[PDB]
Symmetry: C3
Subunit: 112 residues, 3 copies
């Protein structure tokens, strides 16, 4: 079946708990990027300079389509705080997956 990239932008302080909850559920493979974001959360002020772009973490996990709902649930449960700035998750289609070492493709390419 099809594969999807789940791209989540979360608070950096939530990375370890989200990563662990994903791993616990069997989603071990992931790529993490340091980014900056702005949104309705607003910038860090001083006083009374603004820092409009604040540190965030991007997690990217390519998974089978059937697993997207569960990945989303895990990220939301573990990344949320109830305050503005908790982030967003984007699901992007992935048409092909290749393992560099072996040139395996498809579901094989995400399996040991």
């Amino acid at each position: 079946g099809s594969m999807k990239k789940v791209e989540a932008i979360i608070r950096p302080e939530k990375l370890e708990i989200v990563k662990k909850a994903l791993s616990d559920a069997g989603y071990v493979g992931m790529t993490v990027s340091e980014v900056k974001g702005r949104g309705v959360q607003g910038g860090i002020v001083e006083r009374y300079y603004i820092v409009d772009l604040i540190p965030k973490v991007k997690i990217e996990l390519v998974v089978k389509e059937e697993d997207v709902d569960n990945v989303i649930d895990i990220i939301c449960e573990n990344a949320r705080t109830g305050n503005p700035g908790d982030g967003k998750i984007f699901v992007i289609p992935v048409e092909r997956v290749v393992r560099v070492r072996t040139k395996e493709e498809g579901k094989e390419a995400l399996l040991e």
Copy 2:
């Protein structure tokens, strides 16, 4: 589909004006990354902070904005107008489909997820 990811690679010195332009036009949510790149070969050699980069990767900034598909033309026009200089290396923009958008806090999806 309804939503799209605009991935714009621009000059680092254009981040502030492009971000301001976008915010002033009502686009506040964006994610910004530091990257390096090259464009196509040939033509005038790219210069960065005074030096010619004949072969090395050149510092750029990536801005990712997920927006409704109806807003893509506007976003692209705002970025290009405010990012361009007329010299090679001004940038490139890719539009990528986004099938789903979810707000972490509420689990709201779709167009609500990008709003308010």
Copy 3:
């Protein structure tokens, strides 16, 4: 007609080799990002106060090349040939659809925005 983004996550020490190989084959346009990756191995172990702890994220490099669909296989082949080592952690390549490409300087779109200039 269509465009694709080839996104490869490779070992940092293979970036220069992969970049050169791609450029030698005419694929010069690319965007490179430092990232951290978690792989299905390992590894890696640290001890503190009588306890082994594992460190799961390690540095990687992301390369993104937007190309015509007809070139995707060639790009994949070049990356695999030049990024591989035979050990766990050599990386993954993902191909993602791109619906529009725009060159900022000129507003040129599509194939035109990926086309070489005169040497």
